[PDB]
RNA sequence: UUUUUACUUAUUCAAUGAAGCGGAGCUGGAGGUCAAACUCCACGUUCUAGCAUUAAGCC
RNA sequence: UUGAUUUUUCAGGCCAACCAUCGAAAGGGAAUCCGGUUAAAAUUCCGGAACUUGGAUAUGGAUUCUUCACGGCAACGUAACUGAAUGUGGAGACGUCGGCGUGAGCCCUGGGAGGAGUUAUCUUUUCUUCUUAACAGCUUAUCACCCUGGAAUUGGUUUAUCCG
RNA sequence: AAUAGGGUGAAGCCAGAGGAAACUCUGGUGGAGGCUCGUAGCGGUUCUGACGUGCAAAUCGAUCGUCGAAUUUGGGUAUAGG
């Protein structure tokens, strides 16, 4: 691999040598998922800290 | 009584079996109804109510799990998740 | 060994500086959809590399051997 | 047709070891080799590999259970204790 | 007359055990300041065999708290513990299958697995397939618990001590016979050098106490002195009774 | 002199790449407040096999 | 590890879990083949054709005025096409048996071009030569994956019944 | 690192037949087993054979045990005289 152009070794995508497409595709969703539910159960704990 | 009233709506009425059918219906908006089975992963769980959160749809998580939700609407395999297109003869949007 | 395709590259190779001689081989060949006909292959010894040009048209052979540098050995074989 | 009476997956044994000592290895070794439903994608893949390991060949989760079952008798009743008792400490 | 096999295995020449296909130490985490303030979470990675083990073993990663790296820690492995499942550990995690929690936080009754015997040694009781250590009671004016081990001992541990919730997995792996000499081979290939045993009555008297005689028979009384020395530890050692167990106990 | 149990520094056991110990104080949740705020608890992470590293900001 | 300094001084920036060493001519592991040659050496010599590692280094190409390239819905493609500390992974790297499939070498065999044998008779006959290395380019695959689509009258499918 | 060629035919699977059900029967397929016949191999039963100042300080011949595992084996390594 050290003598070997670097097209060979690797994928145009994040993780490209590292992942696959599936397990990236699913990294990115969860990322996004879990950060928006992030700032909903943000807003909810702010909306229980002003009236109970 | 849901199970009854989601029968009724698969003999009557109009409905997409299976996840690539639930998100394009979503997406078209010509889903009245997100119905999710209880061992549905939480990821595509949580995508699929994300998408119906966007197209201001109601889900309903069904209890049991894909095995049952698709005896339930009469078919011979595994339903992880469906969409209501039309209730018919049936009142399930009334209820959820 | 590298096979070189295009005529116009293979004279551009020949004028290397790295370029130390050239081979010129006949080969009496025949397609068994017709007759006789005579293959030339020019052959250009580089540092790391052979080329070889394969010329299966008599008279493109001739022409294009008159057009490599003067300056290189060639062998005939 | 049926091939043997009632030695079933034991008829590898021929006429070894006891008949009593064949029967007992029947029943947990019918056991071993079934395939049960996963609990996660709910097919009926998941086969024993080692000992307490049980794997789906589907969604490729693998689950600690018993030696023989995929889930012994007391990991479910730990399991029904373990939920109760969580209910009253969080109400 | 000559050593004897009891007292050979103490040099632990061919005695050792063999341990190149094992995975790891089963321990739980140091414990660090969020085990003992809060909770730390994290991911079962792996469900693996344990050459000489009748438990699986989870391969469980947790983030570093104090540098960017991660922490691969190796936990007997519960049952129903499944690959993908967050793990917490700590004094305020949740009593769910497979966390670990200080014995004082778990209510009477918790089935309970590698608890440590004393705070931080890391899991010593209830280890081996299909075990478990039930929590009998707290003494929280002395800070001390109560639990009952495989054994039926009832022991008194401080509450601070750690254990994994569930039962072992891999259990009843003792229900089914081994039926051959070369299973019981391949069973000791991967543990150590113990088997096959030879009879002691069937060796010469230089061998073991109980060789000799123009029949095979002990010729002395069987149960030893718990103060005989070694040689002579040949037996039933510091037997309070023996045949066969009739009644309760 | 004998029995018991208090101390920790001798001694002994264990762990860690000696990372958050002990006390007090900030903040809330409470006791019913009978001076005046004393006592107790907590004091940033729990649908998900994602991410977290080489400080932003304010003075 | 850098920026250096020519001030042969330095300035610092990161880290020091673990890490003396020995232990395999059958384990792991950078890279070579063919033809010829001696009385006796050859993957070592000769001829030709390659390869790896370390170092130095210029030219061409590539890239930049939207500074660190484009194309494809996608799987992904390419002659290239910044990337420190630190981190995460992969390869190294792995039992045994069973049948199945593909390849290679060998075995068998037809025509043709040669050479040898038998031939009282018979035998378009019996034997034999007809080869192609490492390396370079293009092309080539089970499996796996992507897009489309939405399936009971269930269908696809292996020698071995698994898949939706 | 090594271990011809056969026999038998366990689970699982396909099809057909019978039954109200609980279930049963048949034909294939499949290829299990410290299974079996039997080479190489490993061993060493009997002739109480040969030899017995030997080919040999343990061999030779026939016969025999076992032959896919508790198998056979090279090298490295550990254990040392009460
Ligand atoms: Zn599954």
């Keep these: 691999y050290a003598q070997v152009s670097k097209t060979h070794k690797t994928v ?10 599936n ?7 969860r990322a996004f998922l879990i950060e928006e539910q992030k700032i909903v159960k943000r807003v909810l704990k702010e909306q229980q800290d002003k009236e109970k | 009584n849901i199970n009854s009233k989601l029968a009724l709506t698969i003999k009557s009425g109009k409905y997409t079996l299976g996840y690539k059918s639930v998100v394009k219906s979503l997406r078209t908006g010509k889903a009245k109804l997100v119905i999710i089975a209880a061992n549905t992963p939480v990821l595509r ?3 699929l109510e994300y998408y119906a959160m966007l197209s201001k749809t109601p889900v309903y998580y069904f209890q049991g799990g894909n095995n049952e939700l698709g005896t339930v609407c009469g078919k011979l395999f595994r339903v992880g998740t469906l969409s209501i297109l039309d209730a018919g003869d049936s009142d399930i949007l009334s209820s959820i | 060994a590298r096979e070189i395709k295009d005529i116009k590259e293979f004279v551009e190779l020949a004028r290397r500086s790295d370029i130390k001689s050239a081979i010129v081989k006949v080969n009496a060949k025949v397609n068994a959809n017709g007759k006789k006909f005579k293959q030339t292959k ?3 010894r580089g540092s790391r590399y052979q080329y070889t040009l394969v010329v299966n048209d008599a008279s493109k052979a001739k022409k294009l051997q008159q057009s490599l540098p003067p300056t290189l050995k060639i062998t005939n074989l | 047709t049926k091939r043997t009476k009632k030695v079933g997956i034991t008829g590898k044994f021929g006429v070894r070891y006891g008949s009593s000592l064949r029967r007992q290895t029947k029943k947990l070794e019918v056991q071993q080799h079934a395939k049960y439903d996963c609990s996660f994608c709910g097919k009926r893949t998941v086969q024993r590999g080692a000992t307490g390991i049980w794997n789906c060949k589907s969604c490729k ?13 007391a990991a479910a009743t730990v399991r029904s204790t373990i939920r109760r008792l969580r209910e009253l400490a969080e109400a | 007359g000559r050593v004897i096999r009891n007292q050979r295995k103490g040099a632990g020449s061919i005695f050792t055990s063999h341990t190149r296909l094992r995975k790891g130490a089963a321990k739980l985490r140091t414990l660090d300041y969020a085990e003992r303030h809060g909770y730390i979470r994290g991911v079962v990675k792996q469900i693996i065999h344990d050459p000489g083990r009748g438990a699986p073993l989870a391969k469980v990663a947790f983030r570093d708290p104090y540098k960017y790296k991660l922490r691969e820690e190796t936990f007997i492995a519960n049952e129903g513990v499944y690959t993908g499942q967050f793990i917490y550990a700590g004094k305020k995690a949740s009593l769910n299958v497979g966390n670990i929690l200080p014995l ?3 209510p009477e009754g918790t089935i309970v697995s ?7 040694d890391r899991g010593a009781l209830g280890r081996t397939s299909g075990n478990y250590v039930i929590i009998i009671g707290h003494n929280p004016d002395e800070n001390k618990t109560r639990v009952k081990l495989p054994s039926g001992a009832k022991k008194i541990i401080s509450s601070d001590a750690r254990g994994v919730i569930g039962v072992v997995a891999g259990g009843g792996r003792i229900d089914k016979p081994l039926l051959k000499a070369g299973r019981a081979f391949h069973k000791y290939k991967v543990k150590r050098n113990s088997w096959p045993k030879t009879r002691g009555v069937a060796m010469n008297p230089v061998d073991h106490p109980h060789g000799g005689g123009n029949h095979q028979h002990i010729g002395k009384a069987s149960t030893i002195s718990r103060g005989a020395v070694s040689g002579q530890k040949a037996g039933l050692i510091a037997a309070r009774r023996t045949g066969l167990l009739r009644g309760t106990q």
């Excluded at chain 5, 590698?114 to 931080?120: D, P």
């Design chain 2, 45 to 47: 769980k949580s995508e």
């Design chain 5, 104 to 106: 004082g936080a778990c």
């Design chain 4, 61 to 73: 989760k693998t689950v600690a259970g018993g030696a023989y079952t995929v889930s012994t008798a």
């Design chain 5, 114 to 120: 590698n608890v440590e015997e004393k705070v931080g």
């Design chain 1, 23 to 29: 397990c990236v595709k699913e990294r990115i969703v």
């Design chain 1, 12 to 21: 145009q995508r994040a993780y490209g040598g590292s992942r696959c497409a």
């Design chain 3, 42 to 44: 020019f052959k250009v």
